[PDB]
Design a protein around this motif. Structure first.
Motif, PDB file in Angstrom:
ATOM      1  N   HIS A   1      74.442  97.234  33.272  1.00 18.49           N
ATOM      2  CA  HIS A   1      74.344  95.776  33.099  1.00 18.49           C
ATOM      3  C   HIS A   1      74.715  95.232  31.865  1.00 18.49           C
ATOM      4  O   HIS A   1      74.352  96.153  30.790  1.00 18.49           O
ATOM      5  N   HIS A   2      74.750  93.986  32.013  1.00 21.88           N
ATOM      6  CA  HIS A   2      74.947  93.511  30.298  1.00 21.88           C
ATOM      7  C   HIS A   2      74.004  92.886  29.708  1.00 21.88           C
ATOM      8  O   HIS A   2      73.399  91.959  30.530  1.00 21.88           O
ATOM      9  N   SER A   3      73.502  92.774  27.970  1.00 28.35           N
ATOM     10  CA  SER A   3      72.005  91.404  27.977  1.00 28.35           C
ATOM     11  C   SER A   3      72.649  91.300  25.859  1.00 28.35           C
ATOM     12  O   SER A   3      71.856  89.658  26.336  1.00 28.35           O
TER      13      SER A   3
ATOM     14  N   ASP B   1      76.962 108.529  41.362  1.00 24.94           N
ATOM     15  CA  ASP B   1      76.189 109.910  41.969  1.00 24.94           C
ATOM     16  C   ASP B   1      75.890 109.167  43.881  1.00 24.94           C
ATOM     17  O   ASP B   1      74.708 108.107  43.309  1.00 24.94           O
TER      18      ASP B   1
ATOM     19  N   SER C   1      74.211 102.789  45.171  1.00 23.21           N
ATOM     20  CA  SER C   1      74.711 101.992  44.549  1.00 23.21           C
ATOM     21  C   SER C   1      75.700 101.918  42.954  1.00 23.21           C
ATOM     22  O   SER C   1      76.462 101.617  42.776  1.00 23.21           O
TER      23      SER C   1
ATOM     24  N   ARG D   1      79.218 101.547  44.057  1.00 23.65           N
ATOM     25  CA  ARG D   1      79.517  99.963  43.760  1.00 23.65           C
ATOM     26  C   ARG D   1      79.968  99.366  42.615  1.00 23.65           C
ATOM     27  O   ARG D   1      80.381  97.958  41.689  1.00 23.65           O
ATOM     28  N   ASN D   2      78.604  99.640  41.160  1.00 21.85           N
ATOM     29  CA  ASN D   2      78.945 100.163  39.942  1.00 21.85           C
ATOM     30  C   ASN D   2      79.939 100.595  39.534  1.00 21.85           C
ATOM     31  O   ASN D   2      80.065 100.598  38.820  1.00 21.85           O
TER      32      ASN D   2
ATOM     33  N   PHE E   1      75.367  89.403  44.696  1.00 22.99           N
ATOM     34  CA  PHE E   1      74.736  89.948  45.968  1.00 22.99           C
ATOM     35  C   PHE E   1      72.866  90.506  46.117  1.00 22.99           C
ATOM     36  O   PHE E   1      72.083  90.090  46.400  1.00 22.99           O
ATOM     37  N   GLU E   2      73.463  90.545  44.121  1.00 23.05           N
ATOM     38  CA  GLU E   2      71.741  90.396  43.349  1.00 23.05           C
ATOM     39  C   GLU E   2      70.686  88.972  43.969  1.00 23.05           C
ATOM     40  O   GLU E   2      69.789  88.637  44.195  1.00 23.05           O
TER      41      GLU E   2
ATOM     42  N   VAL F   1      69.844  89.210  48.019  1.00 25.44           N
ATOM     43  CA  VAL F   1      69.711  90.454  48.606  1.00 25.44           C
ATOM     44  C   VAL F   1      67.852  89.455  48.905  1.00 25.44           C
ATOM     45  O   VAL F   1      67.537  89.854  49.411  1.00 25.44           O
ATOM     46  N   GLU F   2      68.279  88.924  47.102  1.00 33.89           N
ATOM     47  CA  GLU F   2      66.529  87.775  46.752  1.00 33.89           C
ATOM     48  C   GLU F   2      65.872  87.026  48.475  1.00 33.89           C
ATOM     49  O   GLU F   2      65.272  86.747  48.626  1.00 33.89           O
TER      50      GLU F   2
ATOM     51  N   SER G   1      65.823  88.261  51.415  1.00 38.71           N
ATOM     52  CA  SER G   1      64.924  89.816  51.640  1.00 38.71           C
ATOM     53  C   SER G   1      63.850  88.160  51.918  1.00 38.71           C
ATOM     54  O   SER G   1      62.251  89.062  53.151  1.00 38.71           O
TER      55      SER G   1
ATOM     56  N   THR H   1      67.021  98.409  51.006  1.00 40.38           N
ATOM     57  CA  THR H   1      66.787  97.086  49.457  1.00 40.38           C
ATOM     58  C   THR H   1      66.340  95.855  50.188  1.00 40.38           C
ATOM     59  O   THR H   1      65.163  95.528  49.462  1.00 40.38           O
TER      60      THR H   1
ATOM     61  N   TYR I   1      81.580  95.420  45.200  1.00 40.52           N
ATOM     62  CA  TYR I   1      80.132  94.366  44.999  1.00 40.52           C
ATOM     63  C   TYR I   1      80.922  93.076  46.182  1.00 40.52           C
ATOM     64  O   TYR I   1      80.009  93.136  46.956  1.00 40.52           O
TER      65      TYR I   1
ATOM     66  N   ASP J   1      69.666  96.511  40.535  1.00 36.80           N
ATOM     67  CA  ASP J   1      70.388  96.573  41.657  1.00 36.80           C
ATOM     68  C   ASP J   1      71.006  97.870  40.985  1.00 36.80           C
ATOM     69  O   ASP J   1      71.732  98.515  40.537  1.00 36.80           O
ATOM     70  N   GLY J   2      70.158  98.788  41.313  1.00 37.61           N
ATOM     71  CA  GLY J   2      70.051 100.610  40.784  1.00 37.61           C
ATOM     72  C   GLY J   2      70.337 100.890  39.605  1.00 37.61           C
ATOM     73  O   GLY J   2      70.288 102.340  38.978  1.00 37.61           O
ATOM     74  N   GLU J   3      69.537  99.713  38.957  1.00 38.21           N
ATOM     75  CA  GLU J   3      68.858 100.259  37.143  1.00 38.21           C
ATOM     76  C   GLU J   3      67.679  99.609  37.403  1.00 38.21           C
ATOM     77  O   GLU J   3      67.790  98.500  37.734  1.00 38.21           O
TER      78      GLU J   3
ATOM     79  N   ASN K   1      69.782  92.737  21.741  1.00 38.84           N
ATOM     80  CA  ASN K   1      70.099  92.003  23.352  1.00 38.84           C
ATOM     81  C   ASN K   1      68.224  92.023  23.645  1.00 38.84           C
ATOM     82  O   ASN K   1      67.049  92.761  23.554  1.00 38.84           O
ATOM     83  N   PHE K   2      67.962  91.882  24.905  1.00 38.49           N
ATOM     84  CA  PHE K   2      66.770  90.983  25.390  1.00 38.49           C
ATOM     85  C   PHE K   2      66.182  92.017  26.623  1.00 38.49           C
ATOM     86  O   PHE K   2      65.300  92.399  26.837  1.00 38.49           O
ATOM     87  N   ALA K   3      66.914  93.213  26.176  1.00 40.44           N
ATOM     88  CA  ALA K   3      66.419  94.088  27.753  1.00 40.44           C
ATOM     89  C   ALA K   3      67.537  95.696  26.769  1.00 40.44           C
ATOM     90  O   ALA K   3      68.572  95.575  26.471  1.00 40.44           O
TER      91      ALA K   3
ATOM     92  N   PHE L   1      68.973  98.951  29.042  1.00 42.10           N
ATOM     93  CA  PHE L   1      69.006  99.417  30.666  1.00 42.10           C
ATOM     94  C   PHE L   1      68.650 100.965  30.647  1.00 42.10           C
ATOM     95  O   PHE L   1      69.293 101.574  30.428  1.00 42.10           O
TER      96      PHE L   1
ATOM     97  N   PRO M   1      63.006  92.439  45.272  1.00 43.37           N
ATOM     98  CA  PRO M   1      63.269  93.642  46.191  1.00 43.37           C
ATOM     99  C   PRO M   1      63.914  94.466  44.886  1.00 43.37           C
ATOM    100  O   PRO M   1      62.619  95.888  45.020  1.00 43.37           O
ATOM    101  N   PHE M   2      64.183  94.604  43.904  1.00 45.26           N
ATOM    102  CA  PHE M   2      64.738  94.994  43.129  1.00 45.26           C
ATOM    103  C   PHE M   2      63.767  96.060  42.242  1.00 45.26           C
ATOM    104  O   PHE M   2      63.808  97.009  41.898  1.00 45.26           O
TER     105      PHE M   2
ATOM    106  N   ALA N   1      62.470  97.998  44.843  1.00 43.57           N
ATOM    107  CA  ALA N   1      62.628  99.178  44.079  1.00 43.57           C
ATOM    108  C   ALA N   1      62.437 100.106  43.351  1.00 43.57           C
ATOM    109  O   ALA N   1      62.575 101.564  43.690  1.00 43.57           O
TER     110      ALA N   1
END
Lengths: 274, 277, 276, 276
Positions: free
Chosen positions: A1-3, A103, A107, A110-111, A133-134, A137-138, A141, A178, A257, B163-165, B196-198, B200, B227-228, B231
């Motif tokens: 993920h990016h920020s 690994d 996930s 797809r990552n 996707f994200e 599932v929100e 769910s 999930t 994804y 998701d996954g992270e 950056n704001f976070a 990962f 959910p994430f 998780a």
């Protein structure tokens, strides 16, 4: 993920095929197409491309040379990372080579492929799908919270003489988990493994399921081993079966994804019917 | 400048993005609103917002026809500063319908709650909004000196799950910035974020939070993790973190404080935890 | 304007909406529209059958029978959508006696004010106006005596139809009077928009889970129509919070045609508010 | 369904349930489901017998024939349990022309509302809506005009099959319209539970011993089918209080596929209600 920007001739080794197809790109060399992974039109189309790596993953370095690429892309199982720093040093003589590690069976796939489809400059649609996707599932769910908690699900596929129950850490089983969906006690023996395996004598193991998904290829057909399972005597006695709650599940593996979102689409259809 | 030292009393307000909270806080029933997203609001608040004409999409696409139909006397909203040129144009368009006020905000820290303070003023609710800013500043001073000791000893963290992270919120964003403002210290898991704001991390790297004496995870307005985040909380490696063993993991509402009222509830939650140390 | 701040008519033919005016005035008509017994008490219905029928329930007017009643004044209400059609008719009818039509728009207060005018025409102006002021004083009185109830409690007004039910909106009949009172009403009415009610299938009955109190429409003698009765008998219905708690009630004169009837709605809504 | 793809379709193919709609609209169809005479008047059947058959009585759809008819629009109704199956049919059929399928639940009010929809789509919306309202008014009318007889009298709706006979339940066909109406019906209903009908052998005919009036299903011209006819010959039919007492009647259009049909059921129940 990016920020090598704007590549023209891409060779797609294992896990590369899905990235280039999703990207609208024609690859100049490709791993040997297995038909279960693709729609019939995608399989017919991929069969006209030069085969550069076998289904057993041994790479032809001469085929790759002959294809004259700008860029070789591939996905690598993390446990073989060492083996592939050698492979990509070798390959880099022919073109700029990008592998990515993943690994497990969840996930990570797809990552990993999110990365690869950035590299080929499809980063926008890919990132689009990850966000979809994200959000879904929100959305799913919470909208079907009652159903998801009430219902025991199971996800199976057949192997030779035995059937599998997919675990919480792999393929469609991960996505069900999930999502907050509880799953059959048949699942539990799997531990860290991706599935738990049973004999046909043990089909009763699924008697606590209210809904059963079985894995299918990209055309919603079960392979002969799954088909052999759905034909067993004991299978007909399952509360889930005789209640008519047995459904196919395409793209269980979720290699990307986009694919993971088709799994959600299919889980939701089943959820509405409850 | 935000601190001090077109209609007065507007009747028919259309609240685009970030204007929803402004009108809620001012007890005003808008004539048109951005599509309600349930996680931003209380249960009661979300029902209420569902009775109002939707006029903008969650993806920020604006329905001009519906906006005209609502016949508003004022149109309000907040704009990310990187979109400032795009919204000069949206304003020209909308101003044919009603006077339209957009305010810009930069970043993820105090910018947000000052941009909404401005909207609150524009809307006639200036006194409550300034009171709330005065209160946030006073409580930061109060809590700072009253728990000085705990804030010096305790290393905090704020996480949320993708998701996954998972992510560790930085000192320049959301609840991670409100901790900082207060003088709380936070885990070295922040260090890769930079501007950056976070930061990962994989589920493998969860040990990075070993640092933390207390951990907050982001919930919705009703104290539920998505959910994430759930998780994350379930992972085996998580159960080994010293803050988990000590039973010092807590939900955090309104981490992304959009208004000063909101930032004050984050302070409230940070205080209950400080009292327990 | 409806609020203020043939002199003595002996033989009155009362077309549509005219019936309610003479009953309230204690006047005995010489001719009347076909009495439909859902609209009147048992007694009132008996008395209205002994009057010469002069207009059909489908609003067809019998000019010959009107003449033979020998009216000195013909009165009636007119939906404003049919205003044009009715200058034609008033033209024909005026050759028999003075004919007074009055238009009304919508499903809210329009009606009760149009009958207020008809009541004035007929000589009953004082009682009608009195009832109008009374309606207003009771809305004020109730509104503040049970402010707490009116604040907590979510109402819902339903009537049944064939295979579906309706939730009445804030701008019509009994759902208007509730709104005028300042009662709050179920979210179930939202999809109506500017229409007078929202329709739903029996599968959608849980939309009313919202409600603390439910009124169902009935006839002047507190009997629901078969379609409404259909609705209370559904399975899903007994799982409604409002139904579990015993707060389901009849409501007569929901489509209040006069201010007297509007006051009986208020009367009924008041007896419910006491109980909460 | 209540109110508060070609605009003017030329060539309509009527799949199952469309036949009644185009008949009712005055529309000649360019292809039709296999006509069943029991569902139509003798005149209606002659005309239907000139149109290209496009679906079999067993609902196997001949896609070819449909194409040779070159339709504007393909209308028809679908049992909501086969909703799945028919999403593949529509996607198929829509290669040929715009297809409007409407789902319907059960054998009761579902039918007449699902045909009301289809009648709208082929632009017969006014007359169709008109019948819907006329039905609703008549059920209110008849329900209060004959309240005594509905309370007093036990009804039963029956029909014969091969070797057995049926009693229609309160949730289907004319048994529903009787229920809707407030009429009570023989204890013979009770073994159906949620089913549409209870089946009995000729040995169990005495289960109707409690009925004061019995309707037997007939075709559009008041002839019973042969199976029904055979029921009426059994010794235990002949002994029933209602049979001996003279009180046994035909009932056309028991299925009420449309509101016009449903209203003809009502006229017939009313006729018998008068005589009591």
């Amino acid at each position: 993920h990016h920020s090598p920007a704007d590549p023209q001739r891409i060779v797609a080794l294992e896990f590369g095929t899905e990235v280039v197809l999703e990207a609208g790109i024609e690859p100049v060399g490709v791993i040997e197409p297995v038909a279960t992974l693709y729609t019939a039109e995608e399989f017919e189309q991929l069969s006209t491309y030069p085969v550069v790596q076998s289904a057993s993953l041994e790479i032809n370095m001469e085929a790759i040379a002959e294809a004259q690429p700008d860029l070789i892309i591939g996905g690598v199982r993390v446990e073989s990372h060492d083996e592939y720093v050698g492979i990509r040093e070798d390959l880099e003589k022919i073109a700029p080579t990008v592998f990515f590690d993943f690994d497990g069976a969840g996930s990570g796939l797809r990552n990993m492929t999110l990365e690869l489809s950035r590299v080929v400059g499809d980063g926008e649609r890919a990132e689009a799908e990850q966000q979809r996707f994200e959000e879904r599932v929100e959305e799913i769910s919470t909208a079907y919270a009652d159903q998801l908690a009430d219902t025991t699900f199971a996800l199976v596929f057949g192997v030779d003489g035995e059937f599998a129950v997919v675990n919480t850490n792999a393929w469609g089983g991960e996505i069900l988990h999930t999502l907050g969906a509880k799953q059959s006690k048949a699942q539990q023996p799997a531990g860290e493994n991706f599935a738990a395996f049973y004999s046909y004598e043990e089909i009763d193991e699924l008697s606590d399921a209210d809904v059963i998904f079985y894995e299918t290829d990209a055309q919603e057909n079960p392979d002969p081993f799954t088909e052999a399972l759905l034909e067993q005597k004991l299978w007909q006695s399952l509360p889930a079966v005789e209640a008519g709650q047995v459904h196919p599940l395409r793209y269980s593996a979720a290699r990307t994804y986009a694919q993971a979102n088709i799994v959600l689409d299919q889980i939701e259809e089943v959820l509405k019917g409850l």
